[PDB]
Amino acid sequence: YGITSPISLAAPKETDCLLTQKLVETLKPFGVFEEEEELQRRILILGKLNNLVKEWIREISESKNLPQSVIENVGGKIFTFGSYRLGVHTKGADIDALCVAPRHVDRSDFFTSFYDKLKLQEEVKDLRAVEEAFVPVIKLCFDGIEIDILFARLALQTIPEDLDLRDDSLLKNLDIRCIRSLNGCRVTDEILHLVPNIDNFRLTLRAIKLWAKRHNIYSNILGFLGGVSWAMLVARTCQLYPNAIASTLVHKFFLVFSKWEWPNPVLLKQPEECNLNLPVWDPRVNPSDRYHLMPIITPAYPQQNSTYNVSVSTRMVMVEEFKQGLAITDEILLSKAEWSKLFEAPNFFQKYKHYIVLLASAPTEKQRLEWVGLVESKIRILVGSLEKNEFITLAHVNPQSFPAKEEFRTMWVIGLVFKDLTYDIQSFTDTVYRQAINSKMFEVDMKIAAMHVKRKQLHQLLP
Ligand SMILES: Nc1ncnc2c1ncn2[C@@H]1O[C@H](COP(=O)(O)OP(=O)(O)OP(=O)(O)O)C[C@H]1O
Numbered sequence: 306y307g308i309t310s311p312i313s314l315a316a317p318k319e320t321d322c323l324l325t326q327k328l329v330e331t332l333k334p335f336g337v338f339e340e341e342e343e344l345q346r347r348i349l350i351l352g353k354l355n356n357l358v359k360e361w362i363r364e365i366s367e368s369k370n371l372p373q374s375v376i377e378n379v380g381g382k383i384f385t386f387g388s389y390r391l392g393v394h395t396k397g398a399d400i401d402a403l404c405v406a407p408r409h410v411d412r413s414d415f416f417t418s419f420y421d422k423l424k425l426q427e428e429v430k431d432l433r434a435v436e437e438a439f440v441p442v443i444k445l446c447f448d449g450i451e452i453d454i455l456f457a458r459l460a461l462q463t464i465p466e467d468l469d470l471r472d473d474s475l476l477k478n479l480d481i482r483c484i485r486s487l488n489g490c491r492v493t494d495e496i497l498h499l500v501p502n503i504d505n506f507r508l509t510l511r512a513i514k515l516w517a518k519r520h521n522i523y524s525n526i527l528g529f530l531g532g533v534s535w536a537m538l539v540a541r542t543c544q545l546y547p548n549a550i551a552s553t554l555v556h557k558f559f560l561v562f563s564k565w566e567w568p569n570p571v572l573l574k575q576p577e578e579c580n581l582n583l584p585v586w587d588p589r590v591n592p593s594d595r596y597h598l599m600p601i602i603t604p605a606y607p608q609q610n611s612t613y614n615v616s617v618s619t620r621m622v623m624v625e626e627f628k629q630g631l632a633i634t635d636e637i638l639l640s641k642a643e644w645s646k647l648f649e650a651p652n653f654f655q656k657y658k659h660y661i662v663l664l665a666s667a668p669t670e671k672q673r674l675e676w677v678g679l680v681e682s683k684i685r686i687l688v689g690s691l692e693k694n695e696f697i698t699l700a701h702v703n704p705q706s707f708p709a710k711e712e713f714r715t716m717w718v719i720g721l722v723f724k725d726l727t728y729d730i731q732s733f734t735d736t737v738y739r740q741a742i743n744s745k746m747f748e749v750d751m752k753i754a755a756m757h758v759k760r761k762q763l764h765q766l767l768p
Pocket residue numbers: 386387388389393394395398401440442453489531532533534
């Protein structure tokens with residue numbers, strides 16, 4: 306399955322079956338498993354959507370006066386990708402989906418006629434288009450479910466039901482907006498066909514994602530890993546132990562990565578050359594890709610490094626987390642510990658001797674939401690300033706922010722490790738205000754401030 310022979314073909318022992326069942330059981334309480342009723346409800350919602358897509362495309366087809374041997378056979382289908390597709394959807398998160406339509410349907414139609422169709426559907430509320438983004442998307446809450454819809458116009462007269470979007474010939478000549486909108490599905494579909502046992506893969510991913518979250522290292526934006534990245538690490542682990550079940554896979558996961566020789570890239574398959582002029586991660590021909598610290602490459606063309614935002618600080622943090630994970634699973638395997646110990650959250654607010662507290666405020670909840678989103682995307686800047694400081698070894702940003710007239714304030718806690726800081730944090734705040742204003746995304750009285758604190762005096766700035 307992988308690009309290398311597996312490390313071991315051994316299958317589990319009954320001992321492991323029982324350990325795998327216990328793992329499943331310590332997970333339920335965490336809501337890791339979506340409720341079946343909800344899963345059924347999502348399934349029925351998607352079906353309705355898919356029918357709305359077919360309806361719409363059919364309609365466009367007629368207005369373009371195509372023949373009936375075609376109008377009747379023109380397809381149209383919605384494809385789900387990402388987490389919900391992997392079967393490890395994060396309760397509270399949306400459902401990502403790609404609307405695949407034939408040649409005769411333009412993107413303009415998507416944001417016009419299709420958009421107006423969703424507008425007049427009883428279940429549709431909060432309909433909002435963002436057709437000017439990197440990946441054009443139509444967002445909406447469909448019967449209480451949050452959904453993101455991307456559009457892709459393929460060079461086909463009809464969209465056959467069995468269409469497999471992995472086919473690299475489908476991207477040829479397409480507009481980049483169309484190409485980008487296809488990446489999610491292709492990556493997801495590649496992953497699923499790149500693992501020896503979907504089920505075992507699924508359960509392991511569930512565990513790993515929870516683990517990363519409980520350990521404050523789950524965030525693509527902040528330099529750690531996102532869902533897709535975690536999925537690829539688990540998959541590589543699965544390729545290596547093809548007959549193992551979740552129990553040993555979670556353990557192997559830690560053995561394998563706590564010892565990974567970075568920046569050697571994690572690949573799910575051998576990359577193939579494809580003209581297309583699309584950006585491809587490849588240190589052999591792109592000197593800039595040689596600076597990536599923890600490369601985890603997506604398997605679909607154009608292969609890209611899903612973790613180029615990793616810095617010395619985050620990688621270091623994650624390496625240490627992997628080692629502790631290995632240690633815990635070791636004793637879980639010896640029965641000297643229970644699975645609950647893996648998902649136990651270390652007091653982030655107590656593992657470092659020094660911290661930086663980041664405060665973001667706004668005059669209204671709407672703005673606090675926007676503002677916080679902006680500042681979050683700026684935090685890596687500070688982490689960068691900190692690393693370039695002789696006195697600092699690493700900065701660990703706890704990715705889970707939390708609540709601090711009618712105050713509307715949020716705050717982050719950053720862990721520091723030393724080998725005073727006022728200039729760097731002051732520098733950071735000025736940059737945040739400056740960029741946010743230069744990019745016309747600043748509102749009066751939106752505030753951001755940071756203060757260095759010693760572990761001992763963090764208490765007074767928390768609940
Ligand atoms: N509106 C969007 N525009 C562009 N890319 C999107 C959009 N929504 C999701 N994606 C991309 O699709 C990929 C898979 O989605 P999703 O499953 O939500 O990712 P994660 O991998 O972000 O999942 P978790 O929710 O963290 O479990 C990764 C994500 O960046």
